[PDB]
Amino acid sequence: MTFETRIFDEPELEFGDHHHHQDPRLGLSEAGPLQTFLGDVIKIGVVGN
Amino acid sequence: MTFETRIFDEPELEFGDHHHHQDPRLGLSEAGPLQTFLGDVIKIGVVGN
Secondary structure (H helix, E strand, O other), rough: OOOOOOOOOOOOOOOOOOOOOOOOHHHHHHHHHOOOOOOOOOOOOOOOO | OOOOOOOOOOOOOOOOOOEEEHHHHHHHHHHHOOOOOOOOOOOOOOOOO
């Protein structure tokens, strides 16, 4: 048969502090964001009733 | 005599946490700004040779 089948693996995603994992959820919960935020405050404004 | 002369006092500027003074240098050093920055970070970029 002239059919060539490939099964690629799940690609990795590089998180912060040189840690890589295939799941964004567990990867963020383990090592945090790639580019850290200098500070600790994110201010939110709400518009509605 | 024939003219009404008034010498006004030095006006008071309101600084943070209910403090007032006339000199902006001394008022800012001992009381701080009126609206405190919710955070601890100010990022400065430089452009030049």
